[PDB]
Write a structure and sequence with these properties.
Chain B: Plays a role in the nuclear pore complex (NPC) assembly and/or maintenance. Required for the assembly of peripheral proteins into the NPC. May anchor NUP62 to the NPC. Involved in nephrogenesis. Chain B: It is found in: Nucleus membrane; Nucleus, Nuclear pore complex; Chromosome, Centromere, Kinetochore. Chain B: This is Nuclear pore complex protein Nup107. Chain B: Belongs to the nucleoporin Nup84/Nup107 family. This is part of a larger assembly, with chains A (167 residues), B (58 residues) and C (134 residues). Chain A is an all-alpha fold and 167 residues long. Chain A contains 11 helices and no strands. The termini of chain B are far apart. With 134 residues, chain C is mostly helical. Chain C has 7 helices and no strands. Classes of the chains: A mainly alpha (167), B mainly alpha (58), C mainly alpha (134). Chains A and B meet through helix 3 of A and helix 2 of B.
Chain lengths: 167, 58, 134
């Protein structure tokens, strides 16, 4: 519970002298508060680690997941974006940035640009097919032609079966 | 490209150096493919050594 | 303690015995440090080998490795840093002591250093080719 995390973090910050050494435990402190659903105490302990380890891509990713669990779309995306800047191997996180942008704004040139970046890391992916579908049905008559070329060119890789041929 | 839809993983706060790397080699196709190049290049040097290890007079 | 009370289930006999030993594995350093810290204050400037041994008899392996890097004994610092678990190094030193005794190369090494190698090898007493015992 909260009070067990608080009792552990009190004795573990007692067994720490200097402020920077308390901040260096902040990542651990933050995940224990998240495991109690204390999301602001998690945010507050990960930010007090990040302000002492500015370049940790998992601390930025953990702050992004805490903003996703506070419905704060572009702050989840910014902390994920910053985690991709600090470790570009995260193809999954390039896709998760497209996933949270197309769920915020369909007109956003950043949503379409991060889908571009996800497709160029994961071709032949139904999760990227439907992130194009959700832009192109919203691009109107200019959308229709791009959606036709998409449907034919990605069916030609492997269908879902049934659905896209009925659509 | 057949597993990527599924791997909604969570890290343990009590994880070891070993279990952070057991997670990394699932999480990271760049590290995974880079080690497959290490294993490949080490296998070339292995096959040029063959039977010979016990023929060494000091 | 402050390690079983954290567990929201009835804690198993082994987990109790483990933390009784982990607590006593703090006690046996706390009952020793002020004598080690005087012993090191005296020995450090005359023999760093006895100072490294005094840290090790209080489990201060980090300070022992630090003093071995400060004295110019860097393969002793490497040997000591690896000793925090592996039985392989305990058995490799068990062999190396059996080599040096039979080949009479033991009498070409410091008895104070052979005392560290015997401690690390898990040997309470070692019998040398000289018929000395450490």
């Amino acid at each position: 519970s909260k009070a067990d995390v608080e009792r552990y973090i009190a004795s573990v910050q007692g067994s720490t002298p200097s402020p920077r050494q308390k901040s260096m435990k902040g990542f651990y402190f933050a995940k224990l508060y998240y495991e109690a659903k204390e999301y602001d105490l998690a945010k507050k302990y990960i930010c007090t680690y990040i302000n002492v380890q500015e370049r940790d891509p998992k601390a930025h990713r953990f702050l992004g997941l805490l903003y996703e669990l506070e419905e704060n779309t572009d702050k989840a995306v910014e902390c994920y974006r910053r985690s991709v800047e600090l470790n570009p191997t995260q193809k999954d996180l390039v896709l998760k940035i497209a996933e949270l942008l197309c769920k915020n704004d369909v007109t956003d040139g950043r949503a379409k640009y991060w889908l571009e970046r996800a497709a160029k890391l994961f071709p032949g992916s139904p999760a990227i097919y439907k992130l194009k579908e959700q832009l192109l049905d919203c691009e109107g008559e200019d959308g229709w032609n791009k959606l036709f070329d998409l449907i034919q060119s990605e069916l030609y890789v492997r269908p879902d079966d049934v659905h896209v041929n009925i659509r | 490209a057949l597993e990527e839809e599924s791997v909604f993983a969570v890290t343990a706060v009590n994880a070891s150096e070993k279990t952070v790397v057991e997670a990394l080699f699932q999480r990271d196709s760049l590290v995974r493919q880079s080690q497959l190049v290490v294993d490949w290049l080490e296998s070339i040097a292995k096959d040029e050594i063959g039977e010979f290890s016990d023929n060494i007079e000091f | 303690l402050k390690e079983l009370d954290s567990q929201l289930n009835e804690p198993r006999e082994y987990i109790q015995i483990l933390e009784r030993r982990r607590a006593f594995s703090r006690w046996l350093s706390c009952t020793a440090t002020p004598q080690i810290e005087e012993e090191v204050s005296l020995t450090q400037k005359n023999s760093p080998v006895e100072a490294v041994f005094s840290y090790l008899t209080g489990k201060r392996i980090s300070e022992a490795c630090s003093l071995a890097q400060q004295s110019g004994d860097h393969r002793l610092a490497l040997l000591l840093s690896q000793f925090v678990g592996s039985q392989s190094v305990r058995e490799l030193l068990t062999m190396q002591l059996v080599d040096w005794h039979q080949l009479q190369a033991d009498s070409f090494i410091q008895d104070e250093r052979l005392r560290i190698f015997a401690l690390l090898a898990g040997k309470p007493v070692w019998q040398l080719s000289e018929k000395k015992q450490i």
